[PDB]
């Protein structure tokens, strides 16, 4: 039923700047959102998670907040060392269930 859709990105986002990717589709009702980032050939790491009314806390400074219909995530750093595929996830509390791909090449 509930699906997540992200906007494909192809620009290298220069070197020093912020990024903002929207993940949203249909209308969520009782499912929170979580962010996962994985470098090519590595285990994904849990980023901040937004329940549409509050954001979780991770030592990395990746402030990601959602809106009444969409979700957004900011890193404030687009170095090539952070050229990794980000993922948005659908979960009630525990069980991440649905995700959609993206692309965040940095150079």
């Amino acid at each position: 039923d509930i699906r997540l859709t992200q906007s494909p990105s192809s620009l290298p986002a220069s070197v020093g700047d912020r990024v903002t990717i929207t993940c949203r589709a249909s209308q969520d009702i009782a499912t929170y959102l979580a962010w996962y980032q994985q470098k090519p050939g590595r285990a994904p790491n849990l980023l901040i998670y937004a329940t549409s009314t509050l954001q979780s806390g991770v030592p990395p400074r990746f402030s990601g907040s959602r809106s009444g219909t969409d979700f957004t995530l900011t890193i404030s750093s687009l170095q090539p060392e952070d050229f990794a595929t980000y993922y948005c996830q659908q979960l009630r509390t525990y069980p991440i269930t649905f995700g959609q791909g993206t692309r965040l090449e940095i150079k």
């Binding site: 009782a30 009314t53 009630r92």
Partner: protein
């Protein structure tokens, strides 16, 4: 005749009342230097259980689902409820929104047979002071912040949690 007449002049008025150069600063003003910003609190309605209540005795066997008059804790898909019409329980002597109220042991049985009914409304409420006691007491444990007087469970949920909104279309089993 057309006798000449005088012009039109305004009617006379009385002298203004005298003003007093004797009122004190406190007397003229609010009579108190210390104040506090004005707040205008309001009030909101509550949840009250009326009419439908627990039936008398029972005529069931055990935990099972049937589309008939047999079955302890099970019912068909209402498909039209918002936790207010769900409390009506338009069925043949339903002791709750379901046939039986939620329990901390019955939950796995209904969770197992929950294929694509992810969201459903459990007949458990509050009275604005906590201590959730739907129709049998016992203060059923429930952890939640978002939500006031609605409850729902899913496959990945064991302890009942509150739905942040009540007007949402929550099917009842």
């Amino acid at each position: 005749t057309w006798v000449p007449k005088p012009n039109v002049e305004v009617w006379p008025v009385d002298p203004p009342p005298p003003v007093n150069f004797n009122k004190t600063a406190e007397q003229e003003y609010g009579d108190k230097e210390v104040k506090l910003p004005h707040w205008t609190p309001t009030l909101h309605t509550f949840q009250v259980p009326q009419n439908y209540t627990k039936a008398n005795c029972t005529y069931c066997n055990t935990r099972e689902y049937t589309f008939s008059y047999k079955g302890c804790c099970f019912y068909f898909t209402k498909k039209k409820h918002t936790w207010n019409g769900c409390f009506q329980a338009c069925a043949e002597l339903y002791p709750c929104t379901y046939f039986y109220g939620p329990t901390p042991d019955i939950l796995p049985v209904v969770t197992r047979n929950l294929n694509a009914i992810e969201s459903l409304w459990v007949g458990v409420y509050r009275v604005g002071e906590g201590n959730w006691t739907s129709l049998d007491g016992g203060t059923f444990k429930v952890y939640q912040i978002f939500g006031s007087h609605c409850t729902y469970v899913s496959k990945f949920s064991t302890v009942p949690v509150s739905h942040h909104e009540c007007s949402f279309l929550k099917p009842c089993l």
